[PDB]
Design an enzyme around this catalytic site. Structure first.
Site, PDB file in Angstrom:
ATOM      1  N   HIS A 482      49.096  34.056  48.850  1.00 41.09           N
ATOM      2  CA  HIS A 482      48.437  33.015  48.090  1.00 41.09           C
ATOM      3  C   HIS A 482      47.555  33.611  46.987  1.00 41.09           C
ATOM      4  O   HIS A 482      47.933  33.547  45.806  1.00 41.09           O
ATOM      5  CB  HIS A 482      47.671  32.127  49.063  1.00 41.09           C
ATOM      6  CG  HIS A 482      46.928  31.030  48.393  1.00 41.09           C
ATOM      7  ND1 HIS A 482      45.595  30.796  48.635  1.00 41.09           N
ATOM      8  CD2 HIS A 482      47.314  30.125  47.463  1.00 41.09           C
ATOM      9  CE1 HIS A 482      45.194  29.783  47.893  1.00 41.09           C
ATOM     10  NE2 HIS A 482      46.216  29.360  47.168  1.00 41.09           N
ATOM     11  N   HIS A 487      47.313  32.797  42.309  1.00 34.99           N
ATOM     12  CA  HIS A 487      46.054  32.776  41.573  1.00 34.99           C
ATOM     13  C   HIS A 487      45.819  34.006  40.707  1.00 34.99           C
ATOM     14  O   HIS A 487      45.638  33.899  39.487  1.00 34.99           O
ATOM     15  CB  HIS A 487      44.904  32.632  42.574  1.00 34.99           C
ATOM     16  CG  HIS A 487      44.810  31.271  43.177  1.00 34.99           C
ATOM     17  ND1 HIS A 487      43.985  30.298  42.664  1.00 34.99           N
ATOM     18  CD2 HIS A 487      45.444  30.715  44.236  1.00 34.99           C
ATOM     19  CE1 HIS A 487      44.100  29.197  43.396  1.00 34.99           C
ATOM     20  NE2 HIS A 487      44.982  29.422  44.351  1.00 34.99           N
ATOM     21  N   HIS A 673      53.426  28.676  44.487  1.00 33.36           N
ATOM     22  CA  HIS A 673      52.080  28.308  44.898  1.00 33.36           C
ATOM     23  C   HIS A 673      52.099  27.068  45.779  1.00 33.36           C
ATOM     24  O   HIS A 673      51.355  26.981  46.746  1.00 33.36           O
ATOM     25  CB  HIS A 673      51.197  28.055  43.682  1.00 33.36           C
ATOM     26  CG  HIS A 673      49.822  27.591  44.051  1.00 33.36           C
ATOM     27  ND1 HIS A 673      49.425  26.276  43.935  1.00 33.36           N
ATOM     28  CD2 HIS A 673      48.778  28.252  44.597  1.00 33.36           C
ATOM     29  CE1 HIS A 673      48.185  26.151  44.383  1.00 33.36           C
ATOM     30  NE2 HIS A 673      47.764  27.340  44.784  1.00 33.36           N
ATOM     31  N   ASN A 677      50.541  26.948  49.458  1.00 28.46           N
ATOM     32  CA  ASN A 677      49.225  26.323  49.430  1.00 28.46           C
ATOM     33  C   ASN A 677      49.138  25.044  50.249  1.00 28.46           C
ATOM     34  O   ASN A 677      48.211  24.880  51.043  1.00 28.46           O
ATOM     35  CB  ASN A 677      48.815  26.000  47.999  1.00 28.46           C
ATOM     36  CG  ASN A 677      47.427  25.444  47.946  1.00 28.46           C
ATOM     37  OD1 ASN A 677      46.482  26.143  48.290  1.00 28.46           O
ATOM     38  ND2 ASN A 677      47.290  24.170  47.578  1.00 28.46           N
ATOM     39  N   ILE A 822      44.521  24.346  42.521  1.00 31.73           N
ATOM     40  CA  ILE A 822      43.582  24.232  43.609  1.00 31.73           C
ATOM     41  C   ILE A 822      43.821  25.408  44.545  1.00 31.73           C
ATOM     42  O   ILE A 822      42.986  25.716  45.400  1.00 31.73           O
ATOM     43  CB  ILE A 822      43.748  22.902  44.357  1.00 31.73           C
ATOM     44  CG1 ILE A 822      42.600  22.705  45.357  1.00 31.73           C
ATOM     45  CG2 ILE A 822      45.131  22.839  45.034  1.00 31.73           C
ATOM     46  CD1 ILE A 822      41.212  22.701  44.720  1.00 31.73           C
TER      47      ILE A 822
HETATM   48 FE   LIG Z   1      45.763  27.829  45.711  1.00 34.72          FE
END
Ligand SMILES: [Fe+3]
Length: 822
Positions: A482, A487, A673, A677, A822
């Site tokens: 992740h 990110h 993602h 996520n 997010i």
């Molecule tokens: Fe995330």
């Protein structure tokens, strides 16, 4: 002699009366794309002010107001292709759009905060929605186009302010807090061979007083202004949650425990289930501190007085106990929160590349004759490609010593062997719990191998062995699958795109929807999530070693292995096969993440392959795009500069390379993602299913801890995994992260139907969205196919919907956003 125009803007209060925007408050000047001055720059019209409120438009979006304006523009001035805007009001406003009518309609899509004119070193400029590679830029806009890029790049110095739109790179030197305590000092990540790392957005606050190499703390971590997303609804500002949780909610929880108002530890599994049933009773002032906070108050139901209730996690919604099954443990390796680490195992025993002089003899102690492979011999299992593993041995072994020296942390470097049964499901057949061993060791704890067992203390030892594995897996998921791979790996491409591709550029238009909110969530993470004593360090096993572990893994990060087919082949879970639709044959046929992912990958691929040729007819056209070559050169040599020497970087001199690069970027930002996520709370909202930490090794025979495994296995388990207080904090974080904001933009959507004026691009994008709708129907049929129940639903009866493209708002276990949001 006048051009009728319409300005749409949002006053600031709408994203954190209208007559104040009239008079001399706001000036716009049109800029010609076809008639130039004596310097070749498009001629600029007079300052023209907003004339009145338009209330006749069919209906703006919420919070938007329309303003009428008329430009003296006699035709000798040619065709407008841009405009300047000056805000003479003290308070900034959000500029949505300008629309010009009865002139060859002209649309400007702005979506940008415009601060008071005295705060800007050059006047804000906006371009019409046409798309141009640089060689196609109308000559009167060429200089404007390059000067705006120069403005966005800045000069690499200065403290960045809220209204700055300057994109630049820096290392992760802002996580430590050495001025508060030497214990909060952290290694700089990035810029050395010891700690390579992706770059992040430069903030420029300057050095700490105790360490010139670490950046001082700040109340606000800058992002370029239009990266910092406003929301119409406060509840959609999910990115603020981690700061509120670390700074406000965690101390309130801590006080409840310090004052002994709630038991310090869970004593049974039902104490954990209670959290989403009757809830947890907490002191009044603790509830009162929490239930008024935006975003946070959405995480729990409350009586307003003493109760917080968490939502019931998806993984327990049908069977509370199914997470404990070996079936579900193995199934989640292909359809769980972290479905992308399992590998094929093609020899036996498994081997290690680590140095035995450092760690002791690294030979595996798993014996083939001990394993239950449903009647297969080992040679048969290997040859039929039925043996797989979840291998954390080499990843974790270099950190076990330092982790285990921490007071309340104890881990193993684990390996799990999996057998692919004839019915197509995975079976776990052994777990190896390894510890480093060297001459100077004071600990007597030893490595061991644990085999499946359903009765007696052996069943408890096997259940604990699974927990030690999932602590490894949850740490690797959070920090690598992740944080690192989505990110952190994406931010360098965001920065490079804004620095080197004009808003006019086709590849800017292609990629930037896939960056929405990424720099923002990342900056808030540096401040409150991955900082020293932040959320991750105080909830996950490795504590102060967490983020640096991700730098060690980044040593092996390969851009081109982020492509889904390359990933599947590299991990030995698929082979190349031209005769198949996607060019790969899965070795686990019903591998839900991979099978659904290949559909999404192929849809993105078709879209990129249709868009690119609209702007690049030949390989040479890619070679000769100066912005594109500067963009890719900087993304590699600066953004991911610690890996700039690696031979696998695409060169970007061909159409095929441009397609590959954009395809991989879009894949990481959207589907990859999403898949890693949005399952976090659905699977990990029961801490026993996804423990974040382990606190003790297996107990020795003849000890009270061993007798507890016999007499009270639930307590033995709960004492081993994440303690109750960090569980409450961690559940809260992953609940935020698993929530879709109501203003999300999903794959196949764009925030404005007029992002380009090119009809061929718009039609190609419509085809892409239609293709995603058809794919969703196909995935629905997969989940409804009883033959696939074993891997797509499992004993938890949880249909794998994480790669459904669409979703409503909330905690839905489905939906693919465009971006890492997010
Ligand atoms: Fe995330």
């Amino acid at each position: 002699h006048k051009i009728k125009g319409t300005v749409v803007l949002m006053p600031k209060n709408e994203l954190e009366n209208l007559n104040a925007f009239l008079g001399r408050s706001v000036s716009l000047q049109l800029i010609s794309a076809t008639k130039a001055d004596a310097h070749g720059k498009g001629k600029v019209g007079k300052d023209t002010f907003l004339e009145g409120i338009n209330t006749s438009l069919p209906t703006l979006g919420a919070g938007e107001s329309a303003f009428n304006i008329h430009f003296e523009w006699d035709g000798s001035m040619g065709i407008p292709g841009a405009f300047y805007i000056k805000n003479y009001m003290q308070v900034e406003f959000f500029l949505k759009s300008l629309t010009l009518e009865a002139i060859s309609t002209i649309r400007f899509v702005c979506n940008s905060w415009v601060y008071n004119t005295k705060l800007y070193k050059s006047v804000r400029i906006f371009f019409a929605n046409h798309t141009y590679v640089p060689s196609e830029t109308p000559a009167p806009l060429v200089e404007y186009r390059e000067e705006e890029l120069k403005s966005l790049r800045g000069n690499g110095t200065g403290e960045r302010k809220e209204y700055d739109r300057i994109y630049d790179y820096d290392v992760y030197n802002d996580l430590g807090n050495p001025d508060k305590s030497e214990k909060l000092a952290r290694p700089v990540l990035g810029g050395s061979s010891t700690f390579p790392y992706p770059r992040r957005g430069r903030t420029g606050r300057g050095p700490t007083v105790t360490d010139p190499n670490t950046e001082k703390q700040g109340e606000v971590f800058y992002v370029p202004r239009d990266e910092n997303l406003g929301h119409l609804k406060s509840k959609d500002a999910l990115e603020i949650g981690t700061k509120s949780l670390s700074q406000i909610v965690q101390p309130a929880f801590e006080s409840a425990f310090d004052l002994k108002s709630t038991p310090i530890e869970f004593h049974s599994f039902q104490d954990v289930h209670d959290l989403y049933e009757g809830g947890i009773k907490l002191p009044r002032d603790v509830i009162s501190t929490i239930i008024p906070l935006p975003v946070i108050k959405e995480l729990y139901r409350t009586d307003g007085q003493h109760i917080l209730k968490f939502p019931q996690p998806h993984v327990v919604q049908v069977s509370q106990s199914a997470w404990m099954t070996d079936e579900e443990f193995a199934r989640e390796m292909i359809a769980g929160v972290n479905p992308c680490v399992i590998r094929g195992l093609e020899e036996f025993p498994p081997k290690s590349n680590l140095d035995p002089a450092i760690y002791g003899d690294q030979s595996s102690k798993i014996t083939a004759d001990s394993l239950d492979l449903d009647g297969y011999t080992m040679d048969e299992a290997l040859g039929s490609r039925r043996l797989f593993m979840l291998d954390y041995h080499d990843i974790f072994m270099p950190y076990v010593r330092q982790i285990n020296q921490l007071n309340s942390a104890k881990t193993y470097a684990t390996r799990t062997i999996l057998f692919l049964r004839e019915d197509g499901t995975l079976k776990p057949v052994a777990i190896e719990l390894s510890l480093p061993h060297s001459a100077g060791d004071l600990s007597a704890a030893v490595s061991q191998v644990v085999l499946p067992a359903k009765e007696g203390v052996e069943s408890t030892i096997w259940l604990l062995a699974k927990a030690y594995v999932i602590v490894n897996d949850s740490c690797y998921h959070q920090l690598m699958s992740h944080w690192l791979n989505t990110h952190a790996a994406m931010e360098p491409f965001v920065i490079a795109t804004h620095r080197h591709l004009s808003v006019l550029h086709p590849i800017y238009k292609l990629l930037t929807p896939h960056y929405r909110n990424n720099m923002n969530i990342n900056a808030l993470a540096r401040q409150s999530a991955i900082n020293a004593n932040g959320i991750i360090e105080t909830t996950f096993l490795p504590s102060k070693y967490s983020v640096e572990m991700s730098s060690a893994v980044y040593k092996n990060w390969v851009f081109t292995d982020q492509a889904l087919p390359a990933d599947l082949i590299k991990r030995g879970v698929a082979i190349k096969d031209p005769s198949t639709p996607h060019g790969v044959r899965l070795l686990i046929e019903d591998y839900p993440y991979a099978a659904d992912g290949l559909e999404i990958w192929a849809a993105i691929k078709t879209w990129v392959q249709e868009y690119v040729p609209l702007y690049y007819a030949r390989d040479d056209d890619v070679k000769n795009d100066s912005e594109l070559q500067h963009w890719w050169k900087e993304a590699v040599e600066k953004g991911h500069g610690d890996l700039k020497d690696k031979p696998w970087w695409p060169k970007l001199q061909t159409l095929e390379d441009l397609v590959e690069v954009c395809l991989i970027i879009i894949w990481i930002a959207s589907a990859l993602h999403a898949a890693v996520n949005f399952g976090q709370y659905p699977y990990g909202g029961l801490i026993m299913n996804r423990p974040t930490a382990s606190r003790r090794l297996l107990p020795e025979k003849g000890t009270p801890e061993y007798e507890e495994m016999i007499n009270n296995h639930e307590k033995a388990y709960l004492r081993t995994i994440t303690s109750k207080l960090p569980t409450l904090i961690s559940l809260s974080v992953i609940e935020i992260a698993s929530t879709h904001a109501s203003d999300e933009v999903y794959l196949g959507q764009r925030d404005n139907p007029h992002w380009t004026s090119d009809s061929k691009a718009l039609q190609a994008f419509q085809k892409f969205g239609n293709k995603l709708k058809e794919i969703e129907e196909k995935l629905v049929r997969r989940n409804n196919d009883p033959s696939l129940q074993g891997n797509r639903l499992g004993p938890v009866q949880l249909p794998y919907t994480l790669l459904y493209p669409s979703s409503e708002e909330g905690l839905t276990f489905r939906g693919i956003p465009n971006s890492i949001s997010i």
